């Protein structure tokens, strides 16, 4: 009795932090143009997903657990929903991965490569994808043929009629060799490996913006006190290098210049004059250079912060959903193997309880999202 | 082994379908990208279109899968029946939402735009759905033949859930389909949407025969014509130009009253010969833009109202239908009056998107661009 209480009202808790929360979530990115990128698009599906976990996922554990036996169909029917939102927010946190990928790595071509209709498509994808691997069950493959033996063993007319329960209705198979291994599995590896590439990236970005900015300054020491004209020419045409690599625009033309008019000195061989392009390189540098060097840091470490944000966010669905699936493979392996009843109840509610974590992370963590929820809070849901 | 009435009955079925879903999603399609389509009114055809979508994409698939496949257990049937309740339902209540905006406009003009504004229309669109699934899914609720079913179980003496051939007359409720859909949330939505566009015909013939009056007036017509053209002024970017061609005009009927006083009628003729002058420059452009714009009113009116017609003369038999079988069970009624009232009823979602094409202008001129950009296939064309 007040086992069962608990597990509704725990419920019935996951539920009412989970539907506010994305809820919120969608409004946030509807009410904010700053927020219209791909990556948010994504998550706008991740946290629709979210919202049907807690308003029909939820409501049908509790409906089926307080409820009578069932038919074999309406169990069936009911344990599908869940396959599907779960199998949705993968297909949408892998799409955010390869946006958060191709953003570090064709940023040139970003704009032109990855356009709303492409998104939307690939969103739509997700789910019909999503429906295909969900429905999958409904189609045929499950413990129909399994529970007739036994109604007729025991001897009964019709349709099964029993006690609702997942290992009762949904195949083990299907849920470790096809779900988990196929449709889990490999999502989650290639995210992993799509963010440990993104940092790398990132990363590596950042640290030759840095050796581009140390060369330009490391030449300047070595033109200013320099023997041979030989010396000058070898540090100038390595800060054109440089200058070239970094431009990768008028500040950048001014500099380059001023290293072409220093270069033409070199190959006369006059060191003295080579001084006064030195001088005025300085007064560039500081006066254009630093604001690309800088916007560039911001903007790469902008690309750094969302994308640590948006790992988290993995690590967290990979560590509430993992508990589930080793049960599965452990009762699909070992069906003698005796596993206590807390740690499944604790692996169902971290499933049910993911579907309220990402709009807390974003809060917390996603600077754009905090301050509209704030607004969202007081233009409508303030006392 | 199946009948070929029951692949003819699949065929038309299919066929019905296969028309009703390009049809309604090309609609949707053209709101959606036609910002000159981003009003009220057509806010609610997509709604009603999204309705039809809904018929030729679910409840059609439903009736041939229940049509080939086995008997059914009671909820199955249940279940299957209420969609088509829902989505009927909504369609009637996006018509009246429809035909009271075609009201407001035409009634409060001055204050139609911030009255009607996209959020309550939102709402209006909302609570149709919500009404819509509250009104369809009742017979889910308990409305419904189940214990008058489980008796005739028992007393063929067989345990369990009622398995049975699924028909309709079987699990909904006749009382439910007369007294409770068809008499107080169909009947009167019809009744009403028609008086409403009645009164909004009524309003813009009024309104239409008012300029013709004052222009007719204007140019029939000293002090009584003067008085008559004042009058006449008075109950009648380019605000600016009206404004001023008015001012000009009402300038020179002043400039004309001004001998009037005095008593001198020939001079009067100098200035009706530029108050003509003054007509043709100016006002000429109010009455051909106000009956353009006026008689615009007027058109879609016309396209919407037939809509309603169409709904009503679709729907109607299929409702007498179910008073009669409610009222007189003794009554024989053929099958083949049965099929062609259901296949009205599936047919009317293919029936809107063909009207606008037909009589609204801006959809067609839509549906070309969308089939051109997207839905072309000009190298079979260049084959033949
Ligand atoms: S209690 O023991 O009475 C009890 C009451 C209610 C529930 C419950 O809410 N169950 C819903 C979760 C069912 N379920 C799944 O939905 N999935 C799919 C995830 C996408 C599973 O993979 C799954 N595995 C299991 C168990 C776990 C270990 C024991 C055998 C299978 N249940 C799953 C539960 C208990
Ligand atoms: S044939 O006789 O085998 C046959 C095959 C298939 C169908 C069929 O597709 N029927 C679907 C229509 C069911 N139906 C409704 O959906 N509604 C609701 C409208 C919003 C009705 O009101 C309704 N009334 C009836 C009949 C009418 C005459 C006999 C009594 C009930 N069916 C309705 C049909 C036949
Ligand atoms: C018992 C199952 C019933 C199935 C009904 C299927 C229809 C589902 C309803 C969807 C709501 C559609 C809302 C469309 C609003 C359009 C708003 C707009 O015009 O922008
Ligand atoms: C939210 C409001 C209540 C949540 C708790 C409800 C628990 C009911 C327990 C009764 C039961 O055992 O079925
Ligand atoms: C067996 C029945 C299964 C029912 C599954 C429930 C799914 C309901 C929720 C969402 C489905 C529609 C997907 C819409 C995605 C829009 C995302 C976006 O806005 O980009
Ligand atoms: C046998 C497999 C069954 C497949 C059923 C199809 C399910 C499709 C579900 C939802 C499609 C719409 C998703 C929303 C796409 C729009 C994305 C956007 O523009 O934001
Ligand atoms: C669109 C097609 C509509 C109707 C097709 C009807 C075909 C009838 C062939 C029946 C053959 C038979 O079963 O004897
Ligand atoms: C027009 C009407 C012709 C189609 C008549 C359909 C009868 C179907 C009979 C059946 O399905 O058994
Ligand atoms: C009978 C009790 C159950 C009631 C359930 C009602 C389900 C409501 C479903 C959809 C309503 C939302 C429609 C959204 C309309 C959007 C309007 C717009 O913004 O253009």
């Given at each position: 009795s007040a086992f069962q209480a608990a597990y509704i009202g725990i419920e019935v808790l996951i539920a009412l932090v989970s539907v506010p929360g994305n809820v919120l979530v969608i409004w946030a990115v509807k009410v904010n143009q700053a927020l219209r990128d791909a990556t948010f698009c994504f998550i706008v599906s991740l946290a629709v997903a979210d919202v049907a976990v807690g308003a029909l996922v939820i409501p049908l554990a509790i409906l089926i657990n307080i409820g009578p036996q069932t038919y074999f169909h309406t169990c069936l029917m009911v344990a599908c929903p869940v396959l599907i939102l779960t199998q949705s927010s993968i297909l949408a946190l892998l799409a955010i991965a390869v946006d958060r990928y191709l953003r570090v790595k064709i940023p040139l071509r970003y704009k032109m490569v990855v356009t709303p209709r492409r998104a939307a498509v690939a969103i739509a994808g997700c789910w019909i994808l999503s429906f295909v691997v969900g429905l999958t069950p409904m189609f045929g493959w499950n413990n129909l043929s399994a529970v007739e033996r036994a109604w007729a063993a025991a001897g009964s007319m019709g349709e099964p009629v029993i006690k609702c329960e997942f290992e009762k209705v949904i195949s083990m198979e299907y849920m470790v060799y096809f779900n988990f291994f196929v449709w889990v599995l490999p999502p989650?590896?290639?995210?992993?490996?799509?963010?440990?590439?993104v940092f790398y990236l990132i990363r590596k970005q950042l640290a030759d913006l840095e050796d581009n900015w140390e060369t330009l300054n490391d030449n300047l020491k070595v033109i200013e006190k320099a023997d041979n004209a030989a010396?000058?020419?070898?540090a100038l045409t390595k800060m054109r290098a440089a200058a070239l690599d970094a431009q990768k625009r008028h500040g950048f033309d001014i500099l380059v210049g001023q290293i072409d008019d220093?270069?033409?000195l070199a190959n006369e061989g006059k060191v003295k004059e080579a001084q006064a392009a030195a001088e005025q390189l300085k007064t560039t540098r500081?006066?254009?250079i630093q604001k690309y060097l800088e916007r560039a840091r911001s903007t790469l470490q902008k690309e750094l912060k969302?994308?640590?944000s948006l790992a988290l966010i993995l690590f967290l669905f990979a560590l509430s959903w993992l508990p589930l699936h080793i049960?599965?493979?452990?009762?699909?392996?070992?069906?003698?193997?005796?596993?206590?009843?807390?740690?499944?109840?604790?692996?169902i509610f971290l499933t049910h309880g993911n579907s309220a974590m990402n709009p807390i992370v974003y809060a917390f963590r996603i600077q754009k999202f905090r301050v509209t929820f704030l607004k969202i809070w007081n233009d409508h849901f303030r006392c």
């Amino acid at each position: 009795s007040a086992f069962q209480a608990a597990y509704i009202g725990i419920e019935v808790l996951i539920a009412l932090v989970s539907v506010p929360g994305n809820v919120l979530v969608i409004w946030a990115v509807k009410v904010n143009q700053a927020l219209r990128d791909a990556t948010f698009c994504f998550i706008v599906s991740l946290a629709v997903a979210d919202v049907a976990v807690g308003a029909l996922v939820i409501p049908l554990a509790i409906l089926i657990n307080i409820g009578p036996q069932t038919y074999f169909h309406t169990c069936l029917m009911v344990a599908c929903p869940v396959l599907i939102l779960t199998q949705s927010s993968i297909l949408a946190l892998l799409a955010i991965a390869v946006d958060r990928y191709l953003r570090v790595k064709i940023p040139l071509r970003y704009k032109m490569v990855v356009t709303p209709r492409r998104a939307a498509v690939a969103i739509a994808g997700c789910w019909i994808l999503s429906f295909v691997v969900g429905l999958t069950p409904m189609f045929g493959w499950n413990n129909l043929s399994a529970v007739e033996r036994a109604w007729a063993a025991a001897g009964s007319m019709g349709e099964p009629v029993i006690k609702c329960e997942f290992e009762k209705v949904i195949s083990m198979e299907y849920m470790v060799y096809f779900n988990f291994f196929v449709w889990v599995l490999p999502p989650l590896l290639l995210m992993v490996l799509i963010y440990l590439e993104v940092f790398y990236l990132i990363r590596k970005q950042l640290a030759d913006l840095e050796d581009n900015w140390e060369t330009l300054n490391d030449n300047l020491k070595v033109i200013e006190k320099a023997d041979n004209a030989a010396q000058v020419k070898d540090a100038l045409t390595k800060m054109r290098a440089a200058a070239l690599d970094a431009q990768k625009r008028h500040g950048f033309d001014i500099l380059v210049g001023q290293i072409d008019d220093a270069l033409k000195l070199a190959n006369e061989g006059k060191v003295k004059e080579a001084q006064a392009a030195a001088e005025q390189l300085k007064t560039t540098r500081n006066a254009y250079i630093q604001k690309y060097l800088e916007r560039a840091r911001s903007t790469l470490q902008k690309e750094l912060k969302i994308a640590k944000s948006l790992a988290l966010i993995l690590f967290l669905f990979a560590l509430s959903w993992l508990p589930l699936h080793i049960l599965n493979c452990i009762t699909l392996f070992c069906p003698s193997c005796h596993k206590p009843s807390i740690l499944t109840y604790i692996a169902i509610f971290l499933t049910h309880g993911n579907s309220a974590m990402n709009p807390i992370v974003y809060a917390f963590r996603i600077q754009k999202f905090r301050v509209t929820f704030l607004k969202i809070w007081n233009d409508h849901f303030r006392c």
